[PDB]
Amino acid sequence: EVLTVFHAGSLSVPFEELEAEFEAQHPGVDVQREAAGSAQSVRKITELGKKADVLASADYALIPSLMVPEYADWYAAFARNQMILAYTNESKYGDEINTDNWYEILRRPDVRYGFSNPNDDPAGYRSQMVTQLAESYYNDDMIYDDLMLANTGMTLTTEENGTALIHVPASEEISPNTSKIMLRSMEVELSSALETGEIDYLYIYRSVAEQHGFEYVALPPAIDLSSLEYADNYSKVQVEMVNGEVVTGSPIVYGVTIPNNAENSELATEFVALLLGETGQQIFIENGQPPIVPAIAEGKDSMPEELQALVV
Numbered sequence: 001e002v003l004t005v006f007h008a009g010s011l012s013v014p015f016e017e018l019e020a021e022f023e024a025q026h027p028g029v030d031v032q033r034e035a036a037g038s039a040q041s042v043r044k045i046t047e048l049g050k051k052a053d054v055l056a057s058a059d060y061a062l063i064p065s066l067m068v069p070e071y072a073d074w075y076a077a078f079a080r081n082q083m084i085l086a087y088t089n090e091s092k093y094g095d096e097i098n099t100d101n102w103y104e105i106l107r108r109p110d111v112r113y114g115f116s117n118p119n120d121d122p123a124g125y126r127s128q129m130v131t132q133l134a135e136s137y138y139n140d141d142m143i144y145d146d147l148m149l150a151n152t153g154m155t156l157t158t159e160e161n162g163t164a165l166i167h168v169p170a171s172e173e174i175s176p177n178t179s180k181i182m183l184r185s186m187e188v189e190l191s192s193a194l195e196t197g198e199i200d201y202l203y204i205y206r207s208v209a210e211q212h213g214f215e216y217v218a219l220p221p222a223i224d225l226s227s228l229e230y231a232d233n234y235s236k237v238q239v240e241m242v243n244g245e246v247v248t249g250s251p252i253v254y255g256v257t258i259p260n261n262a263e264n265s266e267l268a269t270e271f272v273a274l275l276l277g278e279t280g281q282q283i284f285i286e287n288g289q290p291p292i293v294p295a296i297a298e299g300k301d302s303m304p305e306e307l308q309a310l311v312v
Contacts, residue, residue, distance in 0.1 A: 001026075003267050004051065005033045006041040008058035010081070010207065011254065014280075014287045015056070021283075022274055029267065042066050051261050053268035056275075060255025064298065072257040074299030076311055078276055079284045079291045081205045081252040082226035083130045085113075086214040090197035094215065097201075102217045103134055103143050106201060113147075113201040114182040114190040118154070118168045118239060122247075123187065125239040126225060127203035128154065128166050129249040132237045133223035151177040159238075165246075166239045205252075210288035225252050228296065254289070258304075269304045276310040 003022075007015050012035050019031040036044070038057040044050040046066050055072075057063055063075040085102050087094050097105045106113055116124035132144045144164075148154055153174050155167045168174065176183045182199050184190050191212055194202045202214070209216045221227040225234055234249035241247070256275065258268040274280055281291040297303060297311035 001028050001264065001267055002030045002032055003053050003264060003271055005031060005054040005056070005271070006044055006050075006052040007033060007035055007054075007056040008038040008041060008254070009035045010058050010289075011035075011056050013211070014283045014289065017283045018271070018275060018280060021279060022271055025274075026267075026270070031271075038062055039066075045071055045259055045261075051263050052259055053262040053264050054256065054271055055259055056254065056256045058252075058254055060253050063255045063257055067257065067259070068299075071259050071261065072299075073260060073302040074297060075255045075257040076272075076276065076295040076297040076303075076307075077228065077253045077255050077292055078280075078295040079254045079289045080226045081207060081254075081289055082218070082221075083126055083203065083224045083252075084206045084209055084216040084218060086194060086202040086204050086209040086212075086216045087200060088194060088197070088214055091194075091200040094200075097217055099217055099219065102201075102219070103131070103138070103140070103147065107146050109179075111201065112180055112182060112199050113203070114184070114193060114199040115203040116187055116190065117171055117174075117183060117185045118166075119171050119241050119243075120185050121187070123204060124183075125166075125168070125241070125247055126249075126252075128168075128239055129234070129237045130203065130219060130223050130225065132156070132164050132166060133233065133249065134219075136236070137220055137222050147180075151180045152183075162236070164237045166237065168239060168241050170242045205288070207288040225249060226290070227251055228253060228292070253292070265304075269306055273306050273310065276307065 042062050060077045093105045115127035118124035135143045153169045157165045193199045228251050237249045276295050284291040295311045
């Protein structure tokens with residue numbers, strides 16, 4: 001028996017642990033994972049005619065947006081990422097920093113922080129969103145100005161409806177104050193720089209911090225993009241990139257489905273049951289991608305009975 005699983009690259013570590021566990025309890029089974037970007041993984045099914053037993057997206061909304069109803073009848077939001085501020089024992093004021101004061105530490109002139117290119121990398125525009133959202137949370141209307149506007153060519157306007165709009169110029173025009181900011185397209189350059197102490201703090205996902213053994217400051221769920229329940233707070237910030245595309249703050253939440261054309265749906269059910277069950281929950285916890293428990297499903301009445309038991 002073969003089980004074909006198409007998953008987002010960022011699900012690679014937990015899905016490997018899932019594959020091992022699944023093969024252990026099911027001796028006959030060959031689990032064949034294919035990792036790609038989330039939209040790319042979906043398009044294999046919805047455009048390229050490829051058949052998977054399981055599709056897991058790093059943005060759950062791609063599923064209803066591109067697969068429903070032709071390729072899927074249900075989906076489940078099962079885990080999340082969360083923006084954090086990473087540091088190490090070599091970072092300035094690392095002993096002082098906490099959820100209440102992180103932006104005050106970053107305002108100190110001798111502290112340097114890193115984030116990804118907001119044109120290129122969702123981690124990049126997400127660092128801007130989280131910093132702007134902080135203003136309303138901590139009642140301090142100068143956080144984004146002091147940390148980002150004062151030190152880059154990014155600008156900010158307020159759209160008639162109250163929404164904060166961050167404008168990112170051409171990458172070559174962001175021109176960061178390099179005493180305050182390290183900005184890179186390649187995330188590995190930023191995590192290397194944090195490790196050597198070239199930067200003090202780094203805006204990245206919790207999963208990436210845990211993989212590197214970095215310390216981190218957990219940020220309030222009202223601002224950290226992790227939580228379905230704060231979706232209306234997150235949408236109060238938008239980012240416009242050089243090309244004109246606009247992105248809106250929103251929860252970073254993973255989704256799963258078994259496609260309508262799965263060649264082994266019964267084996268897929270067993271795999272998703274492992275994923276949504278206690279075993280999969282611990283695996284996700286251990287990779288810094290906290291599970292949503294029970295998972296929240298749409299189209300629950302069309303799900304296999306076994307999976308219905310594992311969703312809200």
